[PDB]
Design an enzyme around this catalytic site. Structure first.
Site, PDB file in Angstrom:
ATOM      1  CE  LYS A 131      38.848  40.456  15.971  1.00 37.59           C
ATOM      2  NZ  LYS A 131      38.954  42.076  16.523  1.00 37.59           N
ATOM      3  CG  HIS A 136      35.689  42.525  20.434  1.00 39.15           C
ATOM      4  ND1 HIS A 136      35.766  42.991  19.790  1.00 39.15           N
ATOM      5  CD2 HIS A 136      34.264  42.228  21.032  1.00 39.15           C
ATOM      6  CE1 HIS A 136      34.432  43.552  19.584  1.00 39.15           C
ATOM      7  NE2 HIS A 136      33.650  43.534  20.689  1.00 39.15           N
ATOM      8  CB  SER A 139      47.013  42.760  23.293  1.00 45.53           C
ATOM      9  OG  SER A 139      46.931  43.767  22.217  1.00 45.53           O
ATOM     10  CB  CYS A 141      43.936  37.136  26.951  1.00 48.58           C
ATOM     11  SG  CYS A 141      42.888  37.730  28.672  1.00 48.58           S
ATOM     12  CB  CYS A 144      39.638  35.335  19.803  1.00 48.41           C
ATOM     13  SG  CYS A 144      40.218  36.208  18.418  1.00 48.41           S
ATOM     14  CG  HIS A 151      43.032  41.537  30.144  1.00 49.49           C
ATOM     15  ND1 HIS A 151      42.497  40.213  30.665  1.00 49.49           N
ATOM     16  CD2 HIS A 151      43.848  42.259  30.879  1.00 49.49           C
ATOM     17  CE1 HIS A 151      43.965  39.890  30.583  1.00 49.49           C
ATOM     18  NE2 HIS A 151      44.212  40.533  31.300  1.00 49.49           N
ATOM     19  CB  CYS A 152      39.054  42.330  35.207  1.00 54.80           C
ATOM     20  SG  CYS A 152      38.862  43.401  36.877  1.00 54.80           S
ATOM     21  CB  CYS A 158      40.121  38.701  29.839  1.00 56.23           C
ATOM     22  SG  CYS A 158      39.695  39.815  28.694  1.00 56.23           S
TER      23      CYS A 158
HETATM   24  C1  PLM Z   1      39.891  44.321  53.747  1.00 56.16           C
HETATM   25  C2  PLM Z   1      39.458  43.757  52.538  1.00 56.16           C
HETATM   26  C3  PLM Z   1      39.050  43.983  51.506  1.00 56.16           C
HETATM   27  C4  PLM Z   1      38.339  43.093  50.704  1.00 56.16           C
HETATM   28  C5  PLM Z   1      37.474  44.137  49.459  1.00 56.16           C
HETATM   29  C6  PLM Z   1      37.180  43.292  48.238  1.00 56.16           C
HETATM   30  C7  PLM Z   1      38.014  43.634  46.948  1.00 56.16           C
HETATM   31  C8  PLM Z   1      37.722  44.528  45.847  1.00 56.16           C
HETATM   32  C9  PLM Z   1      38.967  44.638  44.509  1.00 56.16           C
HETATM   33  C10 PLM Z   1      37.728  44.960  43.617  1.00 56.16           C
HETATM   34  C11 PLM Z   1      37.975  44.489  41.770  1.00 56.16           C
HETATM   35  C12 PLM Z   1      37.329  44.765  40.687  1.00 56.16           C
HETATM   36  C13 PLM Z   1      38.114  43.975  39.379  1.00 56.16           C
HETATM   37  C14 PLM Z   1      38.107  45.140  38.306  1.00 56.16           C
HETATM   38  C15 PLM Z   1      39.149  45.268  37.083  1.00 56.16           C
HETATM   39  C16 PLM Z   1      39.009  46.124  36.105  1.00 56.16           C
HETATM   40  O1  PLM Z   1      39.540  47.565  36.843  1.00 56.16           O
HETATM   41  O2  PLM Z   1      38.732  46.529  35.352  1.00 56.16           O
HETATM   42 ZN    ZN Z   2      42.249  39.586  28.694  1.00 53.95          ZN
HETATM   43 ZN    ZN Z   3      42.669  37.019  18.553  1.00 55.05          ZN
END
Ligand code: PLM
Ligand code: ZN
Ligand code: ZN
Ligand code: PAP
Ligand code: PLM
Ligand code: ZN
Ligand code: ZN
EC number: 2.3.1.225
Lengths: 292, 294
Positions: A131, A136, A139, A141, A144, A151-152, A158
């Site tokens: 690494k 990092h 799991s 994706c 690495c 990972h949203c 990611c």
């Molecule tokens: C009425 C439409 C409104 C739309 C508003 C935009 C949507 C926002 C979404 C935010 C997503 C944030 C991603 C973070 C992911 C995580 O939790 O790790």
């Molecule tokens: Zn990821």
């Molecule tokens: Zn790896």
């Protein structure tokens, strides 16, 4: 056997959900609020102004959201991978002391300045690679991720070295998109409750518009203020939970270069690209400047 | 039959203008705003120009679309000769009794005009009695209510339904070109005096100013003409041959004053004045007259 197809598709469910809400917002704001409500009030001046401004925020929002989803995360270079001869020597040996001697010999030919908590070389058994710093394994994706942050799940990707500035701009234009909706629907959100405007379908959407827009503003604002500190300290979300251990011990500011130069690592030196979802991050993600 | 050939070849002026407009969208957004203005570290002007351009571009293409695909209004079925009247008309051989047949039907219709020879305005092809201000067009092969002219650049007729769209099409055409010329000018100066020397951007920025300026100079003359016609309540045909009423030819027989004449085209609601949405008064088969008629 076919579990891959179901797992791969179900990961797009949060993306399709957010996509629907955004498409619904474009309909509710343009048609129900601007055409049925504001244009039905003989306010041609205010109607045109809101429509132009909305499309600016909507474009910067959808542009940032698209770049955050489909920017594939950068993987470690081929120099970090163990060669087929070196991989055999690792799997053949059974002593964890000689295992470290194999990883250390190759790692010292690599720009690595961090180790694990046990003063061992950071190594990934699944990927069979060493690494890089701040990199990092994920799991979700199954790979690495260089300068991995997290990972949203709301995007099917990611947030890493390639995604980071796009993810930040996505949050930025998300508050601006929602704040502009709430600030403009507010003066008319007063109306529908106190029975000044009584349109049937426009009431359902305008009320939901104000509720949803305000809810997303308060929710994302917490996340946006969170990362503003992270960028100034040059710490990913992972590093904010376990500080990286360097040759001189654990350091929470081991990658910090000052508040000004830290923002330049993410957004770059070109000021014109700071607000645009276009890749302007410095470095390559496999090596990072150190405080010492 | 060459009617099928005319229908296909009639879209050539439309496809041509479509190319120039699409080429203009590429040259202004990509070559001028992204490659030229954004390459000059002027992020403020780039965003303003891109936003303003999209405003003019949207209002322009909207008016052009409505001017093309708004079918011209035709006379109502009450104006057509009934199958009983068609036979008695085809049976008769004396042109004096033929007019007595048309005169009998016209008095049951809101008709206040005749031809230059004080005869009933009748269309042999459509076999109908022409409403006021309505004329036949061999390109449309139909009678057009309040017909103005057959513009080939829209492949349609400018009539009672199209007029306000056609006017707005002319309006937003000048503004689109004016905005292009006024913004490209400061950069049109550069490529000639060799301040900017990009190969691809030079061809587009130079052509942008020439094409936009050459369209502004042409349409402004046409736009100023119709602004006078609207104030006079005269179609292009009526501005060349005055309509003949019961009291003789009158060039202002349909004029109701400058204020009320514009309201016949754009309507009373100001919000619809600039939008390509039908807001014209009346039905196209009858129009108010300056005298006691209507
Ligand atoms: C009425 C439409 C409104 C739309 C508003 C935009 C949507 C926002 C979404 C935010 C997503 C944030 C991603 C973070 C992911 C995580 O939790 O790790
Ligand atoms: Zn990821
Ligand atoms: Zn790896
Ligand atoms: N076959 C045609 N196709 C298209 N336009 C025509 C045709 N014939 C005449 N026109 C035009 O439409 C007008 C025709 O007037 P007419 O009385 O001859 O027949 P109409 O019922 O079609 O109006 C003419 O306008 P002008 O006063 O400037 O001469 C003419 O330009
Ligand atoms: C780069 C500038 C592009 C602008 C293109 C604008 C095209 C305007 C076309 C005007 C058509 C006017 C209709 C005339 C009808 C007629 O009387 O024959
Ligand atoms: Zn015609
Ligand atoms: Zn006819």
């Amino acid at each position: 056997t076919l579990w891959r197809c179901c797992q791969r598709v179900v990961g797009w469910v949060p993306v399709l959900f957010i996509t629907f809400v955004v498409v619904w917002s474009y309909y509710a704001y343009v048609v129900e609020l601007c055409v049925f409500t504001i244009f039905g009030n003989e306010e041609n001046g205010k109607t045109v102004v809101y429509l132009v401004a909305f499309h600016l925020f909507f474009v910067m929002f959808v542009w940032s959201y698209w770049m955050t989803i489909f920017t594939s995360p950068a993987s470690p270079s081929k120099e970090f991978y163990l060669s087929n001869s070196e991989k055999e020597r690792y799997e053949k040996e059974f002593s964890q002391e000689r295992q470290q001697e194999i990883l250390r010999r190759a790692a010292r030919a690599l720009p690595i300045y961090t180790t694990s908590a046990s003063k061992t070389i950071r190594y990934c058994e699944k990927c069979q690679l060493i690494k890089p710093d701040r990199a990092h394994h994920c799991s979700a994706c199954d790979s690495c991720i260089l300068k991995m942050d997290h990972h949203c799940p709301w995007v099917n990707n990611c947030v890493g070295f390639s995604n980071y500035k796009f993810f930040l701009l996505f949050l930025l234009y998300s508050l601006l998109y929602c704040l502009f909706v709430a600030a403009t629907v507010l003066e008319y959100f007063i109306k529908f409750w106190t029975n000044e405007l009584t349109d049937t379908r426009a009431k359902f959407h305008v009320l939901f518009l104000f509720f949803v827009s305000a809810m997303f503003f308060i929710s994302v604002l917490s996340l946006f203020s969170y990362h503003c500190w992270l960028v100034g300290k040059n710490r990913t979300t992972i590093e904010s939970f376990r500080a990286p251990t360097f040759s001189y011990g654990p350091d929470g500011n081991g990658f910090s270069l000052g508040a000004s130069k830290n923002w330049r690592q993410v957004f770059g030196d070109e000021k014109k690209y700071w607000l645009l979802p276009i890749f302007s991050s410095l470095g390559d993600g496999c090596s990072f400047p150190t405080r010492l």
